[PDB]
Nucleic acid binder design. Structure first.
Ligand SMILES: [Mg+2]
Length: 95
RNA sequence: GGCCGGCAUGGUCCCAGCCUCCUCGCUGGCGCCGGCUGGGCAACACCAUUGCACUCCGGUGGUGAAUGGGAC
């Protein structure tokens, strides 16, 4: 069962060999155009490696971002995107 | 990274080179053999991982390393 639209896009199948700092930057480099970005969260832990949460300020941005970049080659691997299953705290602390 | 034993080995500097998970270099180290033992995944490598978070957090490996020339 797919997910409902969200301010945060969840991406996976990301090249795990990239360090956290560089990955956040490289990601912001290709997604900042779809709209303001509140934050990007990356973890290289066993459970969270290869994944990232790009938190957009406006749902439309995430939505665009989702349709446009789906499957985009990044660090030699086809990005896989979805909407986050739930709101990120940064969002809750507001709407 | 640290430690011990055995054997071998004239000396002190100089230049160049090379070595390394553990005070990366010129007031580290760069004969041979055997064994004892600590830290840490930070980097690098390999294994495993396709994983939905907002709590930092998988594992194993490396020193089982590296030479020549010159001056007294
Ligand atoms: Mg690791």
């Amino acid at each position: 069962p797919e997910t409902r639209p969200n301010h945060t896009i969840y991406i996976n199948n990301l090249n795990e060999k990239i360090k956290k700092d560089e990955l956040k930057k490289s990601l912001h480099a290709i997604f900042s155009r779809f709209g303001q970005i509140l934050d990007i969260l990356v973890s290289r832990s066993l459970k969270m490696r290869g994944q990232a949460f790009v938190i957009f300020k406006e749902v439309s941005s995430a939505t665009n971002a989702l349709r446009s970049m789906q499957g985009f080659p990044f660090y030699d691997k086809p990005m896989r995107i979805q909407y986050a299953k739930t709101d990120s705290d940064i969002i809750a602390k507001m709407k």
